Design a protein around this ligand. Structure first.
Ligand SMILES: CC(=O)N[C@@H]1[C@@H](O[C@@H]2O[C@H](CO)[C@H](O)[C@H](O)[C@H]2O[C@@H]2O[C@@H](C)[C@@H](O)[C@@H](O)[C@@H]2O)[C@H](O[C@@H]2O[C@@H](C)[C@@H](O)[C@@H](O)[C@@H]2O)[C@@H](CO)O[C@@H]1O
Ligand SMILES: CC(=O)N[C@@H]1[C@@H](O[C@@H]2O[C@H](CO)[C@H](O)[C@H](O)[C@H]2O[C@@H]2O[C@@H](C)[C@@H](O)[C@@H](O)[C@@H]2O)[C@H](O[C@@H]2O[C@@H](C)[C@@H](O)[C@@H](O)[C@@H]2O)[C@@H](CO)O[C@@H]1O
Lengths: 293, 294
């Protein structure tokens, strides 16, 4: 197959780290990305905790437990099948926000528990301390006095909002310590560094209640991820040249280079000006690493 | 472009009515039941209908500013990106839940960055998808007062569907079309009903387990990723129906034939699809007659 990117305007696609529309892109004004969601090669090989559907982003699933005066969740994949530690740092879709407080909303998910009554709850999960061990299959839940009815029950959890850990700032580039003190989590997606030639990594942004820093950056729109998995197009050069074009006239508004590892770069600040957010990325051709933006 | 469907296993795709993985297929109990879902609606050549969006990130969500008029609380709706809802193209803002005549239990957060510097931005609220006060087509819905809304009055929030329950006195009917409201002479903008094909065929529904309490299985007529695929491709529709095979991802054995119609739904001839494994991949075989015999 010939390589391509989605022919969908940027502002109709989802962030890959939270399920929110993209409302911008930017280079970092400071900070190394090693996100575990939104990670895929250009030839369609998923990495980290990344999966296909935006319906999976920043969610968890598992059975709530209570032991030794502490609550937690025994994790599974979002479809209810078991999580195998060999395959990934955590179950697919697991939030990749580290060293912070994850404020989750959850619902019972067993049909037999969904015939009557309110199946919903909320809970805080720290993405820190040794009891945060999703690679080992478990995470601690903060006791809010409203978890007892859910002990022994299977639930699905979604990330509602995020706040800083007491004594620390909220760092959206922090990598969660998935393997606790036991091991480095298997199959972590690697850190990304810019290649040179004045180039800077591009982040796609969404406004989201990461309180104190409500702009979540990711390295690929989720629909790019599913596109590459669908296509499995062979990588045929150092970089894929993209033009970001006017959605109606197809005039080029700016050039980008996508690298095989699954991220893109630009040379920013080429006269003050602002790119619109409703443009469309179009694959032009494979180009050498020396292509100058 | 030549026509195609996603080369993704069914169980990795999302329902189009709730953001949940598909975990089954079914045919309706009454094979003459007419679905008129407003999400997951698209033609085979990529024209969106109803409240259908490209991204699964929009499914069953709302956005707007909370108000309090004399003790009556509500939301003045906008599109999910915060731009105004103009009602040009859809019966409600894109992504709006299409569950009718029931109680929508929403979780919400303030979404203005200036309101996201400190503190807990979150809340929850019930919204009835019934009565004249449920009028998303006219840009407003009533919120049930839970005594915890006042801090949010005048604030912009985004809402998401956490769970659903039946309206007192009624069953939870997941085939019900919400009454989105009428605006004088303006078109409803509703995606059309899909009438059962008959003659042995039955509409295929993709299902997800979800907390629609008392009926925890949500049916839809297309996986969400089919929608974005068709929008992306804009492939001319060259026949009156598309023949698909549902294939084992390993053996590549054909597990069953399906017909996809230009209006954006699928049928089969049950002998039903509920018994098929859920990890198969749909593959476009050929354009066929509207009358092609499965
Ligand atoms: C006010 C209240 O607590 N009512 C309880 C019933 O729950 C309500 O039932 C309504 C339909 O008759 C409607 O679905 C409401 O949304 C629902 O209220 C929700 O659920 C309850 C448990 C509370 O958490 C509320 O705060 C919430 O808004 C309840 O009915 C039973 O559960 C509901 C979910 C539904 O499945 C219904 O069919 C069940 O009979 C009954 C019985 O447990 O108790 C209260 O009356
Ligand atoms: C227990 C409590 O109410 N604490 C308040 C602070 O909120 C907590 O702050 C923690 C970091 O120091 C951490 O982020 C917690 O998650 C957070 O608690 C959450 O938010 C509060 C408001 C409550 O709703 C809790 O139930 C919830 O778990 C609070 O800190 C300020 O807000 C938080 C969210 C964070 O942005 C922080 O940087 C802010 O200073 C302070 C100040 O208002 O008041 C309490 O101590």
């Amino acid at each position: 197959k010939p390589f391509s990117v989605p022919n969908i305007p940027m502002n109709l696609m989802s962030n890959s780290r939270v399920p929110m529309l993209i409302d911008g892109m930017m280079v970092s004004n400071d900070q190394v990305p090693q996100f575990q969601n939104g990670r895929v090669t250009l030839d369609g090989q998923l990495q980290g905790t990344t999966t296909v559907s935006a319906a999976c982003i920043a969610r968890m699933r598992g059975r709530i437990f209570n032991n030794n005066g502490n609550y937690g969740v025994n994790l599974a994949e979002l479809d209810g099948n078991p999580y195998h530690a060999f395959d990934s740092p955590a179950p697919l879709g697991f939030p990749d926000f580290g060293n912070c407080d994850l404020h989750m909303t959850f619902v019972k998910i067993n049909p037999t528990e969904l015939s009557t009554g309110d199946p919903s709850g909320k809970v805080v999960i720290h993405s820190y301390d040794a009891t945060f061990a999703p690679h080992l299959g478990t995470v601690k839940l903060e006791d809010n006095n409203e978890l007892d009815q859910f002990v022994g029950k299977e639930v699905v959890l979604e990330l509602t909002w995020v706040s800083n850990r007491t004594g620390a700032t909220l760092n959206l580039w922090a990598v969660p310590n998935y393997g606790s003190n036991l091991t480095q989590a298997s199959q972590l997606a690697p850190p990304i560094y810019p290649p040179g030639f004045g180039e800077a990594i591009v982040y796609f942004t969404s406004t989201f209640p990461t309180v104190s820093n409500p702009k979540v950056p990711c390295t690929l729109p989720q629909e790019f991820v599913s596109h590459f998995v669908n296509e499995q197009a062979p990588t045929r050069g150092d970089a894929a040249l993209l033009h970001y074009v006017d959605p109606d006239t197809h005039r080029n508004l700016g050039e980008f280079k996508m690298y095989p590892e699954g991220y893109m770069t630009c040379v920013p600040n080429a006269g003050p000006q602002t790119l619109p957010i409703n443009g469309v990325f179009v694959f032009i051709s494979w180009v050498s690493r020396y292509y100058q933006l």
